[PDB]
Amino acid sequence: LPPGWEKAMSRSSGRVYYFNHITNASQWERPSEPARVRCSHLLVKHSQSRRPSSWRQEKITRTKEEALELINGYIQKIKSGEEDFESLASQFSDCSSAKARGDLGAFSRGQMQKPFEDASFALRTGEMSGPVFTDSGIHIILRTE
């Protein structure tokens, strides 16, 4: 199985599923290197975030446990087609790239912080990540090219 795609056991149904320990993606169907990849993301900062500040709120106060909740929340809406990445990203993302529907433009290694990189490279064109933790906050990372 591709980079970090491991199989495992669903603790609700006991039926097969896959999680990726590099992007924290989890999906039921079996899964499927670039020099550069292009990604958009939705960032939800927290108190412990690098710069607890964003175009949305001058001092972020939400805890980490809560940041995650919010992040899980959008994943459900994205996964269920209730909302798309771009809409939630253009509204909620605590990064200024929200103005650009969360695009961060094309990029290669060394360039971004490592957990974001490792996720960004391990996704394939189309995959969204699960929650990804960096010193900045919590990300949902979609890979576009």
Ligand SMILES: O=C(O)c1cc(-c2ccccn2)n[nH]1
């Ligand atoms: O604070 C911000 O504005 C911010 C930081 C990031 C970021 C992007 C990639 C990896 C790590 N952090 N994205 N947005």
